[PDB]
Amino acid sequence: AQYEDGKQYTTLEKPVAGAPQVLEFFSFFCPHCYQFEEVLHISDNVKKKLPEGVKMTKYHVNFMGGDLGKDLTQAWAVAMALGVEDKVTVPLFEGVQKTQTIRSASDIRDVFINAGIKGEEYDAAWNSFVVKSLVAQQEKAAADVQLRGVPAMFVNGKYQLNPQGMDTSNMDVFVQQYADTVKYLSEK
């Protein structure tokens, strides 16, 4: 066939009931995640091709960058709660991987302040129980699929994207292949 299990995707032997439709996992410490976000714009090109009525979820993971890695998952929780994902994603990636000016929770906070979120509003979010269960959600979802690597994408708690089985000669072609695969898996 054209799309085959083990080729453009793998199947979970242990399917996750009630999982979000399109589920992406990343880390601001993850070099391919930086590529996926800033160079390839994967999340975005997938969205562009999903049949609509399908919602996209992206979560941060703990298993990279030790203590800062966890701070980053809480900060991504804050980001989701405030709806400012689109304003901090790029300065968080560049602060962690490009300029390396993010070394502490306080530096993470600076990114949000500079993006225009107010100090009081950030600190309030940061410390809120609505942020704590949102952290819990990110951790539960990664736990449910035994996640040990990022970037990772899962469709309907049963299929996992397998980007190693796609041509990387051209970056545009890779993105479209990746996105069409998500759309196929989505219609499955």
**In the chain, domain spans:** 1-188
Give the separation between CA 133 and CA 114, rounded to whole angstroms: 26
> What letter represents residue 79's amino acid?
A
Say what the resolution is, in angstroms: 2.1
**Number of Cβ atoms within 10 Å of the Cβ of 128:** 14
Question: What φ, ψ does residue 161 adopt, rounded to 5°?
Answer: -65, 145
Which helix (DSSP H) or strand (DSSP E) does residue 156 occupy?
Answer: none
Where helices occur in 9-128 by DSSP H, the ranges are 31-34, 42-49, 66-82, 85-93, 105-114, 119-127
Contacts of 119 (CB under 8 A, 6+ apart): 109, 113
Query: How many Å apart are CA 180 and CA 87, to the nearest integer?
Result: 27
Measured in whole angstroms, the distance separating CA 34 from the mean position of its chain's CA atoms is 10
**Pure H helices in 128-170:** 129-144
In 3-state terms the chain splits into helix, strand, coil percentages (rounded to 5) of 55, 10, 35
Strand partners of residue 23: 57, 154
CATH T-level fold of 1-188: Glutaredoxin (3.40.30)
Residue 151: is the preceding peptide bond cis (ω within 30°)? yes
36 touches 151 (CB < 8 A): yes
In the Cβ-directed half-sphere of 40, how many Cα atoms lie within 13 Å? 23
Residue 29 tokens read as 């410490």
Which of 43-56 are b and which e, b meaning 16 or more Cβ less than 10 Å from the residue's Cβ? bebbbeebeeebeb
Q: How far is CA 129 from the centre of its chain?
A: 22
Report how this structure was experimentally obtained. X-ray
Contacts of 67 (CB under 8 A, 6+ apart): none
Report how far residue 103's alpha carbon sits from residue 85's, in angstroms, rounded to the nearest whole number. Answer: 20
